[PDB]
Paper text:
A major player in this process is the UCS (UNC-45/Cro1/She4p) protein UNC-45, a myosin chaperone critical for the assembly of thick filaments. Specifically, UNC-45 was shown to promote the folding of the motor domain of myosin molecules. In this process, UNC-45 acts as a co-chaperone together with the general chaperones Hsp70 and Hsp908,11,12.
While extensive crystallization trials of the UCS domain containing various KR mutations were not successful, we succeeded in crystallizing the wild-type UNC-45 protein in a crystal form, capturing the UCS domain in a distinct state. The corresponding structure of UNC-45717 (the number reflects the shortened crystallographic c-axis, when compared to the previously reported form, UNC-4581511) was determined at 3.8 Å resolution and exhibited a similar domain organization as UNC-45815: the chaperone adopts a V-shaped structure with the myosin-binding UCS domain opposing the core region constituted by the TPR, central, and neck domains. Like UNC-45815, the UNC-45717 molecule formed protein filaments in the crystal lattice using the same 4-helix interface to connect molecules. However, a pronounced structural change was seen in the UCS domain, a right-handed superhelix that was bent to different degrees reflecting two distinct conformational states. Its N-terminal (ARM repeats 10–12) and C-terminal (ARM repeats 14–17) halves are connected by the irregular ARM repeat 13, the hinge of the domain. The disrupted interfaces between ARM repeats 12/13 and 13/14 appear to provide the conformational flexibility to allow for a 15° rotation of the C-terminal portion, a gross rearrangement resulting in a 10 Å shift of the C-terminal ARM repeat. Although the N-terminal UCS half is held in position by the underlying central domain, B-factor values increase abruptly from ARM repeat 14, the first segment of the C-terminal UCS subdomain. Together, the crystallographic data underline the structural flexibility of the UCS domain, which can adopt discrete conformations. Strikingly, mapping the KRcanyon mutations on the structure showed that the corresponding lysine residues cluster in a well-defined region of the UCS domain, contributing directly to the interface of the N-terminal and C-terminal subdomains.
Numbering used by the authors: 7 to 469, 475 to 507, 525 to 557, 560 to 607, 622 to 913
The structure:
Amino acid sequence: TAEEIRDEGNAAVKDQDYIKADELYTEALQLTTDEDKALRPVLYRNRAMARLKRDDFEGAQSDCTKALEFDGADVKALFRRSLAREQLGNVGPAFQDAKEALRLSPNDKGIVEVLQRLVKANNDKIKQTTSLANKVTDMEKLAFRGEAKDTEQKMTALNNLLVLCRESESGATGVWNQGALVPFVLNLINDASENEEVTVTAIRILDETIKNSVRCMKFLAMHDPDGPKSVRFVCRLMCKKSTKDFVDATGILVQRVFNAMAKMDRQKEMKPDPEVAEANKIWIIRVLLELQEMLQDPKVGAVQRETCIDLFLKNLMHMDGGIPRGWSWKFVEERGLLALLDVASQIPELCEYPVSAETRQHVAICLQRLEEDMVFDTKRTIFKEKVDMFFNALISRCTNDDEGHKYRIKLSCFLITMLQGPVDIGINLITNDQLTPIMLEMAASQDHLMQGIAAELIVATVSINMLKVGIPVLRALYDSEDPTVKVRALVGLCKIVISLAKTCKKFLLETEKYSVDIRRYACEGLSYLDADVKEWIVDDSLLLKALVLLAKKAGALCVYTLATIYANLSNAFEKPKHVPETHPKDTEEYVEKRVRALVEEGAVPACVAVSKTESKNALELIARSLLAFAEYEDLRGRIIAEGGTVLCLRLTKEASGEGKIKAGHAIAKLGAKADPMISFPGQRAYEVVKPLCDLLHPDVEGKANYDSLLTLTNLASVSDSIRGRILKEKAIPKIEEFWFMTDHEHLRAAAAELLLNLLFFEKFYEETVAPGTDRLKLWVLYSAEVEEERLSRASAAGFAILTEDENACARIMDEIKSWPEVFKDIAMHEDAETQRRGLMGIANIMHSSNKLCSEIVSSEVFRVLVAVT
C-alpha cells in the first residue's frame, strides 16, 4: 500500500499541477519511519522536492535534512537543501550544501548553476549584510529611540523598516536582528499616548519577521523561562491597548503562532503537516487552553474577545484548514466545548464579561463550521449530546420566576444564536415541550428585554409546530409602544401587501431615536422583502441615503442585510442545473435605473465597510452586487472613485464557493475599458495578476470568457515587468481555449499584443515553440478581410514583425494562395487601416529572399500601382 500511493505523487506532479502533488506524499508518510526504512527517506526526498517546487523552503529544508538523516546518499536532497538555503538568505550553508553534491556527481548543469550564483552571492553577501546591519541599526535609532520631528520621522522610519523586512527574506533576517525586534516592538505598544498607526506598523513588521518558523517560535519562548506563562503573554497581547485596527493586527501575531506549530495555509491553499503538529502539540494545547481560558475572562475586552473567537474557526476545523483530527475532538471532550457554548448565551445586556453586539457573527460561524469539522460518525452525536446536556443544564436551572429570569434570557439568546449557525441542532432543541410555554411566558411580561428577544427568537426561527405558535404572538407584540419591540417585530412580517414597508421607510429615514441595534433590525427586516418592492425603493432617495449612512455608522451586523439589499433589487445569482416577463421592476430598463441611482447615492463605502465580516455567503452577495454595479456608462470611474476593485480583489482571496468567481468576473467587468494605470495603479497591478488566472479554469462557453479575455487585453499594454509576472503563472492552457473554439471574439487582437511584446526571454520562446504553423496561417487568413476592421490590421502587424526573423522565413513558403487574398483586400477593400497594414506586411515578405519574390509578382504590383495614386 506504500508504493501504491508513492507512485501517485510523482504522477500528480506532471498530470496537471504540483499544488495537489505536495500533499500526496504528505499523506503517504503516515506509515513512514516504522514499517520500512527504505521507502520513507526517498519519499521524504520527493516530498521536499515537491514543496521546493512551490515556494516553501523551510519545510523543504527540514525534510531534506530528514532524508539525509539515514546515510546522506541522497544527492537530490543536497541540491534541494542548497536551493532552499539559497532563497533562505543564509547562503553560507547553501554553498557547502552544494559543493558536497557537485563533488558527488560532477555532471548536470543545474548543480553548477547553483554554485555559479552562489559565488557572487557569498562574494557580495558580507558587504550587503554589513550594509544591512548599518541600515537596521540606523532604522532602529530613528523609529524607536531619541529622534526628532515627533510623528513625522518615526512613522516614516519604521515604514521603511517594514519594507526592509518585507520584500527581501535576507532583509527579513536582518530586521529581526537575530532576536531583538520584539522588545522594541512591545515596548512601543506600552505607550498609552502613541499614535495607533505607528503601533500597527510596528506589529506589522513583527508578524512579517516571524512569518517563517523558528523566528516565530522564539517569539513564544523568549518571554518567560517556563513555557505556559510565555504563551499567555503572546495570547494576552491584544489586552494591551485595543484602539480600533490595533486589535485586528495584534490578532495576526497569535494567528501566526498557529501557522508555526502546525505549518498552515496563511492565505494560499496549503495543508498543515502532521509531522510538525505532533511535535508541537505541547505548544498547541498550551495556546488553545489559553485562548479557551481567556475566552470567558472578565478582564478580556469586547472586540478583542471576538477576535479571540475568530482564531478558533480559522484553526481547529480540520475539515477546512487547521489542526488535524483528534485535536478537533480534544476541544469537545473537556471544558473546551461546554464553555464555548456559554459565550453565545451572553448579550450586551446580560453577560458578566464585556460582549459586543457584533459578537453574533463570530459566535454563530465557528459553531456552524464546528458542525462541519464534526462530519465523522461518533462526532455528530458527541457534539449534539454535549449541546443537549447543556440545554438540559439550563432549562432545569432557569426557574423563570424568582430572579431566574436572567437564566431564561440567557437560554433564549443561546438559542437565537444557533439558528444563525448550526441549524441542525438548533431546530433539534426547539422540539422540546418546555420551550414554547417559557417563550410565551416571556412574551407578555413587563420586562422589556424578554419581550424584545421573544420576537427576535421566532424571527430567528424563520426557515414546524412551534412556528405556528410564535407568529401570532409576534404580531400581537408588534403594536408595542417601545421601538425595540416594534422594530424587533417588523422583521417577522417581512420574514413571511407591502404595508410594512411604509413604516420601514420612516424607521430608518429618521436618524434620531433609533441608533445602535435599533437601526440594525430596521434594516434586517427591510432585507426580507423582495419581488416588485425594488422600484418602490429606488424612487425614494432618502432610503438609499439613510441605508448608506447606517452602513457607514458602525455597520458591523449590517452585513447580510445590505448584501441582500442591493443584490435582490438588480443582481441575479446563478443556480446549478411568464411572471418575470411582465415585471417592470427587475427585467429591462428598471434594472438599469436601480443600479444607476444606487451607485450615485453612494453604496460603495458602505460595501467596503460592511465587508469586514468573514461571512462567506455575504461575501458572495457583496461580490454579485459589485459586478452588478459595473458594466454601465460611467460606472467604470465610479468603482475606482471609492475603491470597489481594491476590496473586490480583497474579497477574492476568501469567499464562498462561487464567491471567488463572482469577485473575479466582477473585477473584470469593473475595469478593462478604463486605462492601464487606472485599473491597477502602482503596487496593486501585481495583485490583480492572480485573479485573471483561474478565470479560464472552467470552460470557454458563457459570458464569463469574453470578460476574462477583455481585461487581460489591457493588463499587458503597459510596462514589461507585468508581462513577465503573467508568464510565471503559465497562461498557455488558457489561450489554448480560445485558439480552437471561440468564434465571435476580439481576443485574437489581445493575443497579438501578448505574444509580440512581453518579456524577451518568454515571447521569443513562445512565438517559436510548439507547432506554430497554423498560428502563422491564421495570422494571414484573417488579415484579408473577414468583415472586421481590427482583425485585418492586428492580424497583419505580427506578419510584419515576424517576417524579420531568420528561422521564420523558411516556413512562409508553405501556403501561396493566402497572399492574393490579403494583397487584393488592401487596395480593393473599402477599409483604410488594412491598406497600410497590408502593404507594410507585403514589403517585409518580399525583402527576405528572392525565392518568393517572383511567386507573387502581380499581387504586389496591384498594391504598388494603387499606392502611387
